[PDB]
Amino acid sequence: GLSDGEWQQVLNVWGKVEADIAGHGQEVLIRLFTGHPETLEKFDKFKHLKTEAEMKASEDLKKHGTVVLTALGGILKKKGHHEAELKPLAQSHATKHKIPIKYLEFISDAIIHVLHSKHPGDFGADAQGAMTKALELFRNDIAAKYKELGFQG
Template structure:
């Protein structure tokens, strides 16, 4: 639980502006991992130079960070949140488990640069996300999704 508390101490700025931070995270994801942009069909054709001004990209990032905020605030008691998330991401979106690792990296970097999440906090975020990703993987396995 300490890891959740460490991350939540820097979550305030993100929560205050999910759209801003969501856009930053998505842009970081697509910049650091260009192939990730192909995983989002509606974003695949957007030129890198146009990502920053794209409201749909920022909105998608905001939705992602809001869900992450729910997971963080559950402090490990996230089964009721993870199950439907994993189900939709397996059945509808076909999101690989590795993709969650990439978004974790982007979130850590943006929070480190813009929200004051220091190195220890970024390590805590990675541990928290490892647990969440593992739990998503359990649901994926139950559904027969290789993820």
């Protein structure tokens, strides 16, 4: 798990996201979709987005970014004690949305990228380490639920 010090770092970094949840959420999804176009195909509601300009101009993409980061934020503030919050997400993403765990790796990496891109020189090495641990814990606990379900993709 994470130490108390590491959790404090995670939640301090998260304050950056909370100051502009929509902007961070938008950029995370754009980084995901542009880096990994196959991910867009999991979203029937974003398939029409054929250019990054269209992605940037999409109100609905910003809205979904807010939904995604709000859910993740709720999970992070549990400091690992997130079974009730994480179980339903793991199950909707495996059974309804059919999201391979690889894509959760992609979005985790996208969050780290966006934090550096929006806050260059202000996302320190200790902060990256702590946030990375938190995202790995999130992904790993989802992975355990995926295995229960026998879900691969």
